[PDB]
Amino acid sequence: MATLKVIGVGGGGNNAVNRMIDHGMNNVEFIAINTDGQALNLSKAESKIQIGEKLTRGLGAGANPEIGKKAAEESREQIEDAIQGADMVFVTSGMGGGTGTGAAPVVAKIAKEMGALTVGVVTRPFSFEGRKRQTQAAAGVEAMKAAVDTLIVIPNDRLLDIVDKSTPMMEAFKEADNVLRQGVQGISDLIAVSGEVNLDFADVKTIMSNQGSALMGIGVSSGENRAVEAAKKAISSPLLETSIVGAQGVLMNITGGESLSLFEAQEAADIVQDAADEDVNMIFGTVINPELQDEIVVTVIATGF
């Protein structure tokens, strides 16, 4: 089977990896990468890589992205060996600081040059962190786009749209982690289960390779109108920079029980074509899971904007 690895780069990246291991997630290998040895010693990841020990002496990059870049380059062979064998690599990082901003594009490039399908999932900083953080982050975002196959960007300011005045900050951060966690889970399930209309990792590659911005979403629903509601959920995250409008390629999977109807499959497909507003390259699949009764799940991967 294809092997999927998730790499957290810098403090936010390593936080996401820890929170996803906590949630449980298997068939996925985790790798934590950082300059900061204090933070890295707390990582729950099976594979830990301290970069730039010489440059930083176990500290972080002190918000200098050039030091994160030089720290990754210096540790290229330890990064290659941790990646080796991966068919797909998800590189997650908070843009704007020193280590994620500088090192995450180098990790991505190493992954892509070793043959993995390479997906970045990165955050931009909150506005309240100031203009410079934001400018450094935008330079990181540009570097990541040049190095990955597909990029998903999560503006942290979007978390302010889904909290109330009391929502704990750690709960907000878990919501942003879901973008990555559901993407990865979605792909993992699409590879593992055999569908009636079967999708596989060759279809993932066709839709995601060398294709810029991406959306990855899962939607689940029941009852009346379940296929439309699940498909609208899959494509409508309030956390994303890139909405599905304009998508040129789509991978879409519908999973349901024995009651799944042809009519409802068509309805869900049309939701995604309409929101696309394009002459799309759609690869459609279907799985019948008899353990499902009233539930239907729609998975969507959209690219090509």
Q: Residues interacting with ligand GDP, by CB under 6 A? A: 10-12, 15, 60-61, 94, 96-100, 123, 125-126, 129, 133, 156, 173, 176
Instruction: List beta partners, residue 221.
Output: 296
Q: Which does 62 bind (CB under 5 to 8 A by kind): K ion, ligand BEF, ligand GDP, none?
A: ligand BEF
- 133 annotated binding-site participant: yes
Torsion-angle region of 31 (φ positive above 0: left; ψ -120 to 50: alpha; else: beta): beta
175 exposure class (CB count in 10 Å sphere: 0-12, 13-18, 19+): middle
Task: Choose between 157 and 200: whose C-beta lies nearer to K ion.
Answer: 200
Examine residue 105 and tell whether it contacts ligand BEF (CB under 6 A).
no
The dihedrals phi and psi of 99, each to the nearest 5 degrees, come to -80, -55
> 63 is in the binding site of which of K ion, Mn ion, ligand BEF, none (Cβ under 5 to 8 A by kind)?
ligand BEF
Q: Is residue 52 within the footprint of ligand BEF (CB under 6 A)?
A: no
Residue 92 within binding range of ligand BEF, rule CB under 6 A:
no
CA distances from 100 to 20, 54, 62, 120, 181 (A): 18, 18, 12, 11, 19
b or e along 249-269 (b: 16 or more beta carbons within 10 Å of the residue's beta carbon)?
bbbbbbbbeeebeeebbeebb
- Please tell me whether residue 140 binds ligand BEF under the rule CB under 6 A: no
Interacting residues toward Mn ion by CB under 5 A: 11, 36, 60
Which of ligand GDP, K ion, Mn ion, none does residue 176 bind to, with CB < 5 to 8 Å depending on kind?
ligand GDP
Considering the complex, what minimum distance in angstroms separates the CB of residue 144 from Mn ion? 17
Residues 248-287 that bind ligand BEF (CB under 6 A): none
Gap between the Cα atoms of 173 and 163, Å rounded = 10
> Cβ of residue 138: shortest distance to ligand BEF, in angstroms?
16
Binding interface with ligand BEF (CB under 6 A): 10-11, 35-36, 60-63, 97-99
Numbered residues of the known binding site for GTP: 11-15, 98-100, 129, 133, 177
